[PDB]
Design a protein around this ligand. Structure first.
Ligand SMILES: COCCNC(=O)N1CCN(C(=O)c2ccco2)CC1
Length: 119
């Protein structure tokens, strides 16, 4: 029933993601000097440092909003990859499974707590 607990839970999950080698490609913005066409394909860049800064700034209201931005990291990788067997895309899929496994209880607890609050 703690409707604020999602924020520390998301901080801790981001800490786990940053320790994970599969987050290597996703920790900071794509450099257009390395990938000159990146913004020709990707409309809305996202990375985990941006997600963490948004959280720490107090600019997420709910864990659903954070989840939308994290999912955008993964959909950007799927859109940019020239192969479904690329190194970086393959890393994105494992990291996505990890994130979804861990965010499930954060979303459930928040939605439960908020329903209780509004009862
Ligand atoms: C060390 O990380 C530097 C920042 N990241 C980065 O440059 N990226 C990450 C996003 N990305 C892809 O998802 C992708 C799919 C297939 C090839 O790349 C493009 C490359």
């Amino acid at each position: 029933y703690d409707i604020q607990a999602w924020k520390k839970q998301c901080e801790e999950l981001l800490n786990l993601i940053f320790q994970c080698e599969d987050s290597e490609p996703f920790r900071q913005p794509v450099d257009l000097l390395e990938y000159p066409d990146y913004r020709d394909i990707i409309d809305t860049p996202m990375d985990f440092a941006t997600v963490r800064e948004t959280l720490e700034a107090g600019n997420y209201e709910s864990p659903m909003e954070l989840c939308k931005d994290v999912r955008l990291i993964f959909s950007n990788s799927k859109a940019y990859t020239p192969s479904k067997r690329s190194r970086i895309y393959s890393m994105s899929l494992r990291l996505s499974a990890f994130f979804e496994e861990h965010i499930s209880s954060v979303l459930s607890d928040y939605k439960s707590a908020l329903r209780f609050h509004k009862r």
